[PDB]
Amino acid sequence: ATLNQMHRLGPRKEPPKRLGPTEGRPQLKGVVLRTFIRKPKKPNSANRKCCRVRLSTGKEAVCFIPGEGHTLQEHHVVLVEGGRTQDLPGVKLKVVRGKYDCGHVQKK
Amino acid sequence: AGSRLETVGSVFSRTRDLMRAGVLKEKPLWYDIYKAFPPLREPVFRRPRLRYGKAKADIQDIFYQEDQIRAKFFATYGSGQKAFDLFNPNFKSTCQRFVEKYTELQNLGETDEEKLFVETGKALLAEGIILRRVRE
Amino acid sequence: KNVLKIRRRKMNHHKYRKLVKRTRFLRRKVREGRLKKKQIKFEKDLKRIWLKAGLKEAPENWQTPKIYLKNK
Amino acid sequence: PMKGRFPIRRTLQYLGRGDVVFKESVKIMTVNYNTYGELGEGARKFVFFNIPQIQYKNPWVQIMMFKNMTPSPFLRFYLDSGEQVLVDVETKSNKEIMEHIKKILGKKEETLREEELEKQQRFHPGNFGPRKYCLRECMCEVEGQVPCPGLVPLPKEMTGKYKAALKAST
RNA sequence: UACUUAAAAUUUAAGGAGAGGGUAUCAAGCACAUUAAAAUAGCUUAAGACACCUUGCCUAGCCACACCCCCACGGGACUCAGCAGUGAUAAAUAUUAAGCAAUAAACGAAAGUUUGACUAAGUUAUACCUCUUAGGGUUGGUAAAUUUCGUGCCAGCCACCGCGGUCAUACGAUUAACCCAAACUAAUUAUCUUCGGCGUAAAACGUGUCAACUAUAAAUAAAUAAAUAGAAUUAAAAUCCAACUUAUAUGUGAAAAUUCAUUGUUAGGACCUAAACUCAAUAACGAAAGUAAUUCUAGUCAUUUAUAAUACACGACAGCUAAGACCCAAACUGGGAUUAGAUACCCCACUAUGCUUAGCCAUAAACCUAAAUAAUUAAUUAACAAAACUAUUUGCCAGAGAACUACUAGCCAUAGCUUAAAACUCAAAGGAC
Numbered sequence: 001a002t003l004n005q006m007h008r009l010g011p012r013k014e015p016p017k018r019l020g021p022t023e024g025r026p027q028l029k030g031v032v033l034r035t036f037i038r039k040p041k042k043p044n045s046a047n048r049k050c051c052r053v054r055l056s057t058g059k060e061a062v063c064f065i066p067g068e069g070h071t072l073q074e075h076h077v078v079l080v081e082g083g084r085t086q087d088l089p090g091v092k093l094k095v096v097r098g099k100y101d102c103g104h105v106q107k108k
Numbered sequence: 109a110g111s112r113l114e115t116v117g118s119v120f121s122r123t124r125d126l127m128r129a130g131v132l133k134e135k136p137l138w139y140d141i142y143k144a145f146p147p148l149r150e151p152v153f154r155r156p157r158l159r160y161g162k163a164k165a166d167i168q169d170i171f172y173q174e175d176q177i178r179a180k181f182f183a184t185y186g187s188g189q190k191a192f193d194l195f196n197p198n199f200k201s202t203c204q205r206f207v208e209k210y211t212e213l214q215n216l217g218e219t220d221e222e223k224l225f226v227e228t229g230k231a232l233l234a235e236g237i238i239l240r241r242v243r244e
Numbered sequence: 245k246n247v248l249k250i251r252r253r254k255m256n257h258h259k260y261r262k263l264v265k266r267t268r269f270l271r272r273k274v275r276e277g278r279l280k281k282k283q284i285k286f287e288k289d290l291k292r293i294w295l296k297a298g299l300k301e302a303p304e305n306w307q308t309p310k311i312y313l314k315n316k
Numbered sequence: 317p318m319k320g321r322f323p324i325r326r327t328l329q330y331l332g333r334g335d336v337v338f339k340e341s342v343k344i345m346t347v348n349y350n351t352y353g354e355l356g357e358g359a360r361k362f363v364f365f366n367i368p369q370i371q372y373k374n375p376w377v378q379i380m381m382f383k384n385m386t387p388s389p390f391l392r393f394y395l396d397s398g399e400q401v402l403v404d405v406e407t408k409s410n411k412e413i414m415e416h417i418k419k420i421l422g423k424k425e426e427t428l429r430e431e432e433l434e435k436q437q438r439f440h441p442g443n444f445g446p447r448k449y450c451l452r453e454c455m456c457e458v459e460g461q462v463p464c465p466g467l468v469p470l471p472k473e474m475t476g477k478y479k480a481a482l483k484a485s486t
Numbered sequence: 487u488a489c490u491u492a493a494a495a496u497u498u499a500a501g502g503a504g505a506g507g508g509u510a511u512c513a514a515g516c517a518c519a520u521u522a523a524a525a526u527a528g529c530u531u532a533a534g535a536c537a538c539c540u541u542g543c544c545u546a547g548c549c550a551c552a553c554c555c556c557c558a559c560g561g562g563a564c565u566c567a568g569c570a571g572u573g574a575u576a577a578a579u580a581u582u583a584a585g586c587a588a589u590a591a592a593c594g595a596a597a598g599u600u601u602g603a604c605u606a607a608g609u610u611a612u613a614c615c616u617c618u619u620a621g622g623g624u625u626g627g628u629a630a631a632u633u634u635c636g637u638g639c640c641a642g643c644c645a646c647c648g649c650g651g652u653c654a655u656a657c658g659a660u661u662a663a664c665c666c667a668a669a670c671u672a673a674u675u676a677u678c679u680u681c682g683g684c685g686u687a688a689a690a691c692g693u694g695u696c697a698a699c700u701a702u703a704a705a706u707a708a709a710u711a712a713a714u715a716g717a718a719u720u721a722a723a724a725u726c727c728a729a730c731u732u733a734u735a736u737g738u739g740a741a742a743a744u745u746c747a748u749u750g751u752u753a754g755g756a757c758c759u760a761a762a763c764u765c766a767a768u769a770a771c772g773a774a775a776g777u778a779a780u781u782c783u784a785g786u787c788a789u790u791u792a793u794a795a796u797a798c799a800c801g802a803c804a805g806c807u808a809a810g811a812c813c814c815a816a817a818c819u820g821g822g823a824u825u826a827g828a829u830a831c832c833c834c835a836c837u838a839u840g841c842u843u844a845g846c847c848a849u850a851a852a853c854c855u856a857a858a859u860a861a862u863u864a865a866u867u868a869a870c871a872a873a874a875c876u877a878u879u880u881g882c883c884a885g886a887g888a889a890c891u892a893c894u895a896g897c898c899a900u901a902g903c904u905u906a907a908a909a910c911u912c913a914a915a916g917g918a919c
């Protein structure tokens with residue numbers, strides 16, 4: 001672009017930073033609604049443990065539960081955090097182990 | 109260990125550099141000779157490029173003043189029936205004798221080209237040279 | 245130079261043309277209603293002007309032109 | 317590569333090299349120059365190289381330039397009194413034009429220095445406060461003075477916590 | 487605070503050199519002007535008006551707000567956005583504390599009095615500082631550092647690339663190392679922001695003309711090869727009609743259907759529909775699209791040069807509207823073959839349509855995939871294409887797909903064109919060799 005064209009337009013317009021599943025917040029608190037299994041998109045093979053939750057904002061999201069074995073059930077309370085599960089498409093939230101009803105993984 | 113880079117610098121500069129580096133401990137025998145009696149131009153690599161646009165070479169067409177007279181003689185009489193001998197360094201052709209006489213008359217002060225061309229033909233005719241005015 | 249990018253656009257346009265053909269009658273009714281709402285919005289915007297200016301009736305001999313109807 | 321011809325003209329150092337600071341009377345400087353010709357070459361160079369420097373040092377002066385309106389280039393200054401100073405810059409180098417206008421309508425070096433000193437009259441080295449305005453924020457920074465309690469803990473007897481305990485003890 | 491008249495601090499009102507968030511799919515606002523007999527018809531705006539959305543900024547500090555109704559006569563859902571504290575809510579968690587001793591403010595002539603300002607404390611790894619203890623994470627690559635076993639595409643793991651189906655340095659447990667350390671790791675947020683590009687990768691607009699700026703500096707142009715429009719004209723080959731005439735004609739790789747209302751000849755007649763061989767191995771004209779059978783008429787030409795849209799005029803083919811034309815070609819359709827099928831490729835027939843005259847439509851791989859203009863050819867090989875490269879002006883581009891899409895506005899367009907997003911998905915997509 002010419003110097004006249006750079007002057008008439010100025011600095012590049014910056015698209016706004018749209019928020020993610022946590023809505024620009026470190027964590028959210030949600031109530032478990034259902035516990036189910038999700039299948040990782042190929043080339044991976046597993047039965048990943050997930051749960052649906054109703055977040056404090058009022059929306060409902062799918063959250064991956066990390067660790068080997070959880071005791072979560074419906075009506076439990078959990079603290080979710082950000083971070084996508086790479087193989088699980090659409091799962092953009094995770095549960096925090098050791099907060100509210102969710103507990104630390106039982107060591108073997 | 110050497111400098112096989114013939115596109116940067118020259119054989120002399122690369123040999124100068126190798127000795128400064130410390131890799132070449134003995135001067136080549138041709139080195140001091142080049143230092144004392146170098147070439148006119150440094151032998152450095154240059155990539156030939158084509159000329160583009162309106163760039164042109166600088167070569168003068170070699171045309172002496174005798175050629176104006178010689179062109180007329182070949183158009184009027186062609187090449188002399190006597191054959192050119194280009195091995196004799198002092199050969200005098202029929203056309204060269206015409207141009208020598210044509211010059212002599214012009215020194216006298218004749219200003220008309222037509223006068224100098226028809227008078228020269230008469231002079232050579234007296235000399236006995238066989239000039240054929242071959243239009244063909 | 246392959247034509248792969250042209251083939252993606254080729255399929256999108258082919259499928260889109262068949263979608264419009266299937267729902268041609270529905271799309272016609274959407275348009276006639278979108279134009280009607282477009283006309284009402286035009287009339288209301290003209291009524292806002294004279295009412296704000298303080299007139300209680302539209303200027304004498306004025307009838308809002310119907311500009312979106314099948315006049316041509 | 318910086319765009320345009322002579323990109324050095326678009327540097328703060330070049331703009332600050334201008335030496336013509338007009339007197340307060342000068343309000344407008346109209347520049348009439350011709351884009352084609354031989355006697356106007358210095359004028360064209362003056363608009364190219366010098367007009368930016370003049371505007372940088374005289375932000376409140378209106379410089380308006382007109383092209384190819386007259387046979388010869390000239391400069392006309394409009395003063396606040398209503399006087400009009402016409403300058404003829406034909407056959408004159410751009411440097412010569414700058415020197416001419418500096419002499420007739422330029423502030424002297426003495427005047428400019430005096431204004432600079434007056435501007436800084438209210439800054440005092442002894443004054444304490446924020447870094448933007450002062451050298452030192454607190455007297456604790458000075459050598460020999462009691463240091464800041466955050467950096468160096470104060471003696472117990474100089475602390476309100478300790479003094480309060482004694483008053484209760486008394 | 488001074489004088490009978492002047493120095494400040496602090497404000498208020500009317501303004502304007504310049505600067506000042508986002509969306510142009512917000513493009514028009516609709517009285518937003520001037521004059522001063524009261525007329526004139528103006529004012530703002532692509533150099534961004536107006537509309538909408540978001541946000542405290544100018545930081546020794548400033549601005550706005552003070553239960554709500556912008557305001558607060560009034561009305562109402564009737565007061566901690568003063569200190570501490572509570573309910574609810576939230577990922578978010580300080581004392582319902584002491585003193586007016588210091589400074590500040592208020593009052594008083596004053597000794598003085600008052601103050602949840604403030605001072606000194608309480609609370610909290612949020613930060614810094616001094617000490618003392620040691621914990622936290624990591625160990626496939628990027629990136630410092632793994633022993634053994636268990637598991638066997640399961641259980642699990644990853645910021646990216648990826649790991650796990652029997653010897654897993656990548657999972658879990660151990661072992662040893664590595665990093666940081668009173669912290670350590672996770673999530674969230676913020677800090678880095680245009681002098682780069684546009685033949686083939688995103689990107690030069692289908693074409694030209696007129697403005698205002700920014701640049702440039704010359705004084706010409708045109709001067710019968712196919713621009714364009716109108717009228718007239720016609721050689722070849724078809725078609726129709728007629729005479730004569732084979733028995734078949736037509737068609738394919740081979741067949742079938744079709745046909746004998748055919749076929750072949752005509753130095754016979756009519757027709758002027760449609761299209762213009764050779765020339766053309768040419769490279770002209772025109773802004774582009776486009777234009778080449780012949781003749782005649784009208785006609786291209788000077789702005790220094792580049793640079794234009796929201797205006798104007800054009801714009802292959804296909805398509806639409808009305809009235810005509812019709813030799814041949816031909817979507818569709820019907821008939822015949824082929825094939826597992828053949829809604830096709832091949833055969834035959836015949837429409838819309840290609841033609842004229844009016845109007846619309848405004849799209850092309852509208853592509854030399856090269857914006858225009860003026861220089862230079864050396865002080866220059868990413869690859870390929872079409873050698874490199876400077877300057878000027880405008881346009882355009884900012885990972886891929888979603889998307890020649892949704893919505894918006896304009897349009898003779900109505901299954902349309904131009905304008906043109908986001909969610910969401912992916913870690914690539916793409917160009918050359």
Ligand code: FES
Pocket residue numbers: 454455456457463464465466
């Ligand atoms: S900053 Fe000076 S005493 Fe703390």
Ligand SMILES: [K+]
Pocket residue numbers: 043044045
């Ligand atoms: K795998």
Ligand SMILES: [K+]
Pocket residue numbers: 556
């Ligand atoms: K208020």
Ligand SMILES: [K+]
Pocket residue numbers: 586
């Ligand atoms: K006090």
Ligand SMILES: [K+]
Pocket residue numbers: none
């Ligand atoms: K093993």
Ligand SMILES: [K+]
Pocket residue numbers: none
């Ligand atoms: K491990």
Ligand SMILES: [K+]
Pocket residue numbers: none
């Ligand atoms: K381990």
Ligand SMILES: [K+]
Pocket residue numbers: 853
């Ligand atoms: K092309």
Ligand SMILES: [Mg+2]
Pocket residue numbers: 252255256
């Ligand atoms: Mg598609």
Ligand SMILES: [Mg+2]
Pocket residue numbers: 511893894
């Ligand atoms: Mg929209």
Ligand SMILES: [Mg+2]
Pocket residue numbers: none
């Ligand atoms: Mg109020």
Ligand SMILES: [Mg+2]
Pocket residue numbers: none
């Ligand atoms: Mg309140």
Ligand SMILES: [Mg+2]
Pocket residue numbers: none
């Ligand atoms: Mg109050």
Ligand SMILES: [Mg+2]
Pocket residue numbers: 566
């Ligand atoms: Mg409070």
Ligand SMILES: [Mg+2]
Pocket residue numbers: 578
């Ligand atoms: Mg906190």
Ligand SMILES: [Mg+2]
Pocket residue numbers: none
């Ligand atoms: Mg007092």
